[PDB]
Design an enzyme around this catalytic site. Structure first.
Site, PDB file in Angstrom:
ATOM      1  N   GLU A  35      11.412 -12.187 -13.374  1.00 40.68           N
ATOM      2  CA  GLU A  35      10.555 -11.648 -12.326  1.00 40.68           C
ATOM      3  C   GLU A  35       9.738 -10.470 -12.846  1.00 40.68           C
ATOM      4  O   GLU A  35       8.546 -10.358 -12.567  1.00 40.68           O
ATOM      5  CB  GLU A  35      11.393 -11.182 -11.132  1.00 40.68           C
ATOM      6  CG  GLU A  35      11.942 -12.291 -10.245  1.00 40.68           C
ATOM      7  CD  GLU A  35      10.858 -13.012  -9.455  1.00 40.68           C
ATOM      8  OE1 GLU A  35       9.720 -12.507  -9.395  1.00 40.68           O
ATOM      9  OE2 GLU A  35      11.150 -14.082  -8.884  1.00 40.68           O
ATOM     10  N   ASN A  41      -0.327 -10.852  -4.768  1.00 45.27           N
ATOM     11  CA  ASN A  41      -0.273 -12.251  -4.341  1.00 45.27           C
ATOM     12  C   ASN A  41      -1.610 -12.620  -3.697  1.00 45.27           C
ATOM     13  O   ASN A  41      -2.406 -11.742  -3.368  1.00 45.27           O
ATOM     14  CB  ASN A  41       0.857 -12.445  -3.329  1.00 45.27           C
ATOM     15  CG  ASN A  41       2.213 -12.078  -3.899  1.00 45.27           C
ATOM     16  OD1 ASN A  41       3.023 -11.425  -3.241  1.00 45.27           O
ATOM     17  ND2 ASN A  41       2.470 -12.505  -5.127  1.00 45.27           N
ATOM     18  N   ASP A  96      -2.195 -13.796  -0.705  1.00 47.44           N
ATOM     19  CA  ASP A  96      -2.267 -13.392   0.699  1.00 47.44           C
ATOM     20  C   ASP A  96      -2.504 -11.900   0.928  1.00 47.44           C
ATOM     21  O   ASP A  96      -2.537 -11.443   2.072  1.00 47.44           O
ATOM     22  CB  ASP A  96      -0.991 -13.820   1.430  1.00 47.44           C
ATOM     23  CG  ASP A  96       0.230 -13.030   0.994  1.00 47.44           C
ATOM     24  OD1 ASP A  96       0.142 -12.296  -0.012  1.00 47.44           O
ATOM     25  OD2 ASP A  96       1.282 -13.147   1.656  1.00 47.44           O
ATOM     26  N   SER A 136      -0.492  -9.514  -0.136  1.00 42.90           N
ATOM     27  CA  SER A 136       0.758  -8.788  -0.297  1.00 42.90           C
ATOM     28  C   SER A 136       0.960  -8.475  -1.777  1.00 42.90           C
ATOM     29  O   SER A 136       0.252  -9.001  -2.635  1.00 42.90           O
ATOM     30  CB  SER A 136       1.928  -9.625   0.217  1.00 42.90           C
ATOM     31  OG  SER A 136       2.057 -10.807  -0.544  1.00 42.90           O
ATOM     32  N   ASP A 183       4.129  -7.665  -4.902  1.00 45.28           N
ATOM     33  CA  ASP A 183       5.546  -7.687  -5.287  1.00 45.28           C
ATOM     34  C   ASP A 183       5.831  -6.440  -6.123  1.00 45.28           C
ATOM     35  O   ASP A 183       5.035  -6.080  -6.987  1.00 45.28           O
ATOM     36  CB  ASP A 183       5.870  -8.942  -6.104  1.00 45.28           C
ATOM     37  CG  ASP A 183       5.698 -10.218  -5.303  1.00 45.28           C
ATOM     38  OD1 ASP A 183       5.799 -10.165  -4.062  1.00 45.28           O
ATOM     39  OD2 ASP A 183       5.479 -11.280  -5.915  1.00 45.28           O
ATOM     40  N   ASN A 199       8.643  -8.414  -2.152  1.00 43.49           N
ATOM     41  CA  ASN A 199       7.348  -8.545  -1.488  1.00 43.49           C
ATOM     42  C   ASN A 199       7.056  -7.616  -0.301  1.00 43.49           C
ATOM     43  O   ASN A 199       7.908  -7.391   0.559  1.00 43.49           O
ATOM     44  CB  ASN A 199       7.181 -10.009  -1.069  1.00 43.49           C
ATOM     45  CG  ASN A 199       5.789 -10.321  -0.583  1.00 43.49           C
ATOM     46  OD1 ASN A 199       5.464 -10.091   0.572  1.00 43.49           O
ATOM     47  ND2 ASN A 199       4.954 -10.840  -1.471  1.00 43.49           N
TER      48      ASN A 199
END
Ligand SMILES: [Cl-]
Ligand code: NA
Length: 129
Positions: A35, A46, A48, A50, A52, A59
């Site tokens: 990750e 991301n 959308d 958002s 991380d 998120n």
């Protein structure tokens, strides 16, 4: 901070992640590796809107507040910046909430595609703990 493999395994174990909700330590170390490559400062945007954050790429759409994710939830009740600290306590506490959400570690895409079903014990081999 960029954690060493065994250094992170020991830190996670101390914070109660070994066998948390049935997931052995090797699972958590594997997820962190893919990750964020063990980097607490990792951030990724991301599609959308958002973002991380941290070692476990939590998120902003549902778990932390970063002030720029419209109509998002702050289920972990913490600023996303807190998830970038050298101290993984915040990330660990939030991850525990996430894994209890109902979908287990499947919430982490990298875990599902790169750790799930593999020999995860290999991620803690040789480590002193
Ligand atoms: Cl589960
Ligand atoms: Na949020």
């Amino acid at each position: 901070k960029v954690f060493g493999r065994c250094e992170l395994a020991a830190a996670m174990k101390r914070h109660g992640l070994d066998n948390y909700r049935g997931y052995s330590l090797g699972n958590w170390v594997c997820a962190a590796k893919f990750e964020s490559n063990f980097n607490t400062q990792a951030t990724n945007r991301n599609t959308d809107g958002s973002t991380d954050y941290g070692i476990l790429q939590i998120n902003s759409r549902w778990w932390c507040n970063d002030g720029r994710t419209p109509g998002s939830r702050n289920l972990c009740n913490i600023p996303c910046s807190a998830l970038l600290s050298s101290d993984i306590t915040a990330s660990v506490n939030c991850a525990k909430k996430i894994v209890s959400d109902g979908n287990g570690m499947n919430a982490w895409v990298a875990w599902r595609n790169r750790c799930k079903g593999t020999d995860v014990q290999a991620w803690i081999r040789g480590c002193r703990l």
